[PDB]
C-alpha cells in the first residue's frame, strides 16, 4: 500500500486553526485526506478534537472540499 494520509502530529483541540507542525504524512487505513493536501489545510479549522495519531478525514475540516 502506497497512499499516505494526513495524521495528527499532536492533539488538535476542537475549533483550532491548523498549522504545519500539527500534520504528518503516514500510510494508514482507512485512508483520510491525501498527504499531498497538507499545504492547503493550513489555517483551516477542525470541527472536533483530533487526538495524536488520528487520521484527518474530510468531514473533520470546516470548509474542506476536493
Author numbering: 0 to 65
Study text:
Based on the molecular-dynamics simulation platform Amber, a refinement algorithm has been developed to obtain structural models of protein crystals in the form of a fully hydrated unit cell. These models typically yield better R free values and MolProbity scores compared with the PDB-deposited or Phenix-refined coordinates. As already indicated, the key advantage of this procedure is that it uses a highly advanced force field in conjunction with a highly realistic model of the protein crystal that is properly hydrated.
Briefly, we use the initial (unrefined) protein coordinates to construct the crystal unit cell (UC). The space between the protein molecules is filled with explicit solvent. The thus obtained UC is used as a simulation cell. The experimental SF data are automatically expanded to space group P1. Hence, the simulated UC is effectively treated as a (redefined) asymmetric unit. In this manner, structural variations can develop among all protein molecules in the simulated UC. However, deviations from the space-group symmetry remain small due to the restraining effect of the experimental SFs encoded in E xray. Specifically, the simulated unit cell containing N protein molecules can be viewed as an ensemble of N slightly distinct conformational species. Generally, our model can be viewed as a realistic representation of an individual unit cell, rather than the traditional ensemble-average representation of the crystal. Compared with the original structure, it shows a substantial improvement in R free (0.194 versus 0.261) as well as in the MolProbity score (96th versus 51st percentile).
